[PDB]
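In the laboratory, one determines a bound structure by crystallizing the protein with its ligand and collecting diffraction data. In a computational setting the workflow is compressed into a single prediction: the sequence and the ligand go in, and a structural description comes out. We illustrate the idea with OLC.
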Amino acid sequence: MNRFGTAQVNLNFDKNFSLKESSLDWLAPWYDSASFLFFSQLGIRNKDSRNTLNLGVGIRTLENGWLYGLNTFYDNDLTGHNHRIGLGAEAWTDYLQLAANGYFRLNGWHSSRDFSDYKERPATGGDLRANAYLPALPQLGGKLMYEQYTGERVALFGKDNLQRNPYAVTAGINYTPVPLLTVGVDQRMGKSSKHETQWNLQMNYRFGESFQSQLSPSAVAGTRLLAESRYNLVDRNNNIVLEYQ
Ligand SMILES: CCCCCCCC/C=C\CCCCCCCC(=O)OC[C@@H](O)CO
Ligand SMILES: CCCCCCCC/C=C\CCCCCCCC(=O)OC[C@H](O)CO
Ligand SMILES: CCCCCCCC/C=C\CCCCCCCC(=O)OC[C@H](O)CO
Ligand SMILES: CCCCCCCC/C=C\CCCCCCCC(=O)OC[C@H](O)CO
Ligand SMILES: CCCCCCCC/C=C\CCCCCCCC(=O)OC[C@H](O)CO
Ligand SMILES: CCCCCCCC/C=C\CCCCCCCC(=O)OC[C@H](O)CO
Ligand SMILES: CCCCCCCC/C=C\CCCCCCCC(=O)OC[C@H](O)CO
Ligand SMILES: CCCCCCCC/C=C\CCCCCCCC(=O)OC[C@H](O)CO
Ligand SMILES: CCCCCCCC/C=C\CCCCCCCC(=O)OC[C@H](O)CO
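The predicted complex, in structure-token form:
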């Protein structure tokens, strides 16, 4: 063929550009037709002294200028042994990617490496995401999300900021001078003025595309069209939000 999937590196930094998370995600198309794509996604990441493996499958179908997808994931925090299943839906067009995700616990309360004296487990929740790019300047991207989790003492803004049934709204900007490279900044905000600024450095390798074209400013417009976005990584939270008791 022509396109054999995507590998993505992410490095995320806090306000002080202190590195908070590193990840590698890989999407592989197993069956690729002009209307139906079946893929696998495999991910690994390190965050707050924890390593998580994500394993998912997904389908995408194309109709009348739109792409509709479904996906599911098994997420596995290997460090604290926390297990989660996820479901995801997609509705994407040229320049515009919408997504909804649900996250569900598979295991129950067990000892926590974070708090001697209390238990942890996956918090149930979901999110709504939108990624948009400017047709007049497709290197410029915007992002909005809403997240909500259920629980008494949920670590949405980290373990030193546990909250009851918290939410977060994110607003972010990002710039992709070249298909290989994206830089972004996000603001995340919740109840009681909880707040987070996050900086993202992202690399994208598109298997089968020439290296030169992935270093071309003029190739970026094309990355925002369905013929290519059909190969994008699933837009979800690959980290397991824990709650505590
Ligand atoms: C922060 C604001 C963002 C709000 C985002 C709004 C959320 C809507 C997102 C997704 C809607 C789901 C679309 C529908 C997804 C279903 C996919 C499907 O039907 O697969 C077909 C296969 O059978 C192929 O043969
Ligand atoms: C319905 C199927 C159920 C089966 C459940 C297993 C899915 C587990 C997910 C990720 C693990 C590893 C991913 C497996 C490697 C992908 C294969 C591959 O790379 O295909 C060749 C490439 O696409 C040619 O261009
Ligand atoms: C014995 C060890 C068991 C390993 C269990 C590990 C858990 C999940 C890993 C892999 C899922 C299987 C991957 C199967 C390969 C998918 C086939 C494919 O990707 O398509 C080929 C190509 O596109 C056709 O032209
Ligand atoms: C070589 C390519 C450059 C990109 C890098 C690929 C991303 C690595 C992915 C998962 C790390 C899981 C392995 C565990 C290794 C130690 C942790 C680490 O890599 O960094 C510290 C953490 O990110 C700060 O909190
Ligand atoms: C073919 C290409 C290669 C693709 C390769 C993909 C295969 C990865 C599959 C499984 C790893 C899952 C590891 C299991 C670790 C579980 C540790 C845990 O968290 O469980 C403890 C439990 O809570 C105590 O009751
Ligand atoms: C709790 C606060 C949440 C804040 C968020 C509230 C915004 C919800 C609004 C719209 C959702 C859009 C749903 C996506 C609809 C799919 C579009 C589509 O498929 O249209 C095809 C086209 O119209 C063929 O002619
Ligand atoms: C969109 C379709 C997929 C939806 C899938 C639905 C599965 C999860 C539904 C609700 C979870 C929240 C319900 C409340 C259950 C948690 C209470 C509990 O079991 O434990 C609390 C106590 O602290 C410990 O003993
Ligand atoms: C600081 C600024 C950063 C933010 C930068 C992003 C701003 C969003 C711009 C354009 C969204 C792209 C719009 C493309 C929508 C295509 C919809 C479509 O294909 O369908 C037609 C629709 O049904 C009608 O009848
Ligand atoms: C490739 C392994 C996946 C790692 C995931 C990291 C994400 C993107 C990282 C680096 C871009 C590659 C830097 C230079 C090496 C590119 C390999 C290459 O150029 O491939 C030959 C191609 O045929 C030429 O036309």
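The longest strand covers residues 19-32. Keep in mind that any predicted model is a hypothesis to be tested, not a measurement.
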